[model samples]
Target: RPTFYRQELNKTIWEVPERYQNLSPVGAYGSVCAAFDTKTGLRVAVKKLSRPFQSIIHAKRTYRELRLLKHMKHENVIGLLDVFTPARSLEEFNDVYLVTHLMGADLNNIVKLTDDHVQFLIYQILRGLKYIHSADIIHRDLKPSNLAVNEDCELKILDFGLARWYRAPEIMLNWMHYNQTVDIWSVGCIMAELLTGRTLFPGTDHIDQLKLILRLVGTPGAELLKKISSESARNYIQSLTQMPKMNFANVFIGANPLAVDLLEKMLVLDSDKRITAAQALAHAYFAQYHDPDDEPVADPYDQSFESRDLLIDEWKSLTYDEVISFVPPP
Candidate 1:
């Protein structure tokens, strides 16, 4: 049931299916809702951890998203407006709610793009990512839908839930340890899709995703293979027929010259050699759009946690207490 409030209390009203008023946020996490502050008439998106206690995956998702969303700060990073819970006791406090500012839509919603629009949007993402990487954080999921944007081409990265924290290809496919480069790989995938209006590596399955990636980016060399934690994957890579590197110029044929250069750096199988966000922003592709004032001011935030060896409590407690209080600085 949705809860309303008194004049002195929080006036947040959770939107539901039958009486659903607020627009649903675009993405996979549907254990979410939208609401507004009746007092200020401010519309905001909400994040509710679904059945965290019932599933190990849910618990981990809940814990990590709560921590990252709380500490993360930057113009291009999603902002948490408020948080609340109907539960007053620990036993009853299984669900956690996150109130965030509403965005018009995500990048996935847009189909067409101009060169200028592409440049500005990608620049903003790199600026945000620069801050994220500096904090030693990896936004494991950099899919287009997770990137929120307004009509002005302003983009904000959200949903750190399944970031490299849960481990996908690195773990799902071959049980490898992913790092900052994973996010860079996504940047490459996103850039290609944006320019071409078709997915760069459209794979339907786990192995297919790898095969798709190899076809576009070419195979990783022996030096890069040794870095991958999975010896089996390395052996697997050796078994496959050698592939020649595709010319980025020929692939993104009509795109800007500098944009293609950036693409080549990002879409590499050797994650270590992939260009970092800071380096990407400094590239010639953004030279015309770059501004000293546009640099993001990163907040003092550090919540680094490796998934396989993730330490679950201290950081969670500090951030969780703040979220439950429902009082965050704007």
Candidate 2:
């Protein structure tokens, strides 16, 4: 039986940390490497998250990321093929390692994405997001660096470390309440960046982000603004210079009409009005790449595993239970 506590990794690699597209900041971050299984010679990517138990929040974040990757399986979603540590027990386990099938590069490295690739990549992202949502999971942090890709043009969403519990007007305005729609807002930002080959909002702060959003898409309607829970935030937005929304065509010139239409629906100020992954997948933009009839049904990404917030001493027992009691479907 596969177990969480182990002594060695099933692979090998280099100290070549500078190999092209490793985007996460170095120094404080764990090492990401490419390796191969010694027995099967299977090429894989290994990530060593060291000293993960430095804080309670960091530990829980790591736990959710590992568990989510292990459970969610889709062609367009990163796979957690194997996990182990060099430590033999709780006291020795400071480093956590994850093994995934090796990918060519992350989307951040791709500079000249053609419109066709843009459509295909977004389509795949939606498919992956559709699966994630169905599992009741909100990926929260969907960015270019977290998106893995191959030369074959395949793309998958990765990194649940920054995944948010929910998203919407509430979260943006300092209220804790939100839902899957946060991901939709992020998708819009990413899509726009891909089309323009530059960051859209690129805000230094929350208010700056909201300011940029309002500038680009114009202010939310009165009804949508009325739902704001934060009086300060609501008043702040009310004071911003509101302009009539620019013609998307004026901005995304030479881009596909269908693609523009889909993007417009995604970047809505009102998360409630945001186009869903399923709905976007069915748009005419992807008609050539996928059959709308076969699009995956939408499911909420709301499931979670939280029986315990594993502490250094108690974590071993928690992992042992997963090793013996849990059996993933074959």
> Which run of 10 residues does model 2 get worst, by summed lDDT?
19-28
**Reference-based TM-score of each model:** 0.81, 0.81
Candidate 2 lDDT by residue in tens digits, 61-153: 556656666676677878677666545565555666666767767778775568888888888888888777777677777777778888787
lDDT to native, each model: 0.67, 0.66
lDDT of 1 at 102: 72
Query: Which parts of model 1 have CA positions greater than 4 angstroms off?
Result: 1-30, 55-57, 89-91, 164-176, 228-231, 300-320, 324-326
Q: Model 1, residue 47: what's the lDDT?
A: 64
Query: lDDT tens string, model 1, 28-120?
Result: 343555555553466666665555445545555666666667667688888666665566544455556676777768898865588888888
What number of clashing residue pairs does each candidate have, in the order they appear?
A: 2, 10
Which pairs of residues collide in candidate 2? 133-299, 133-300, 133-301, 134-299, 136-300, 136-301, 136-302, 137-301, 137-302, 167-179
Which 10-residue window in model 1 sums to the lowest lDDT?
A: 4-13
Q: Local error of candidate 2 at 207, Å?
A: 3.1
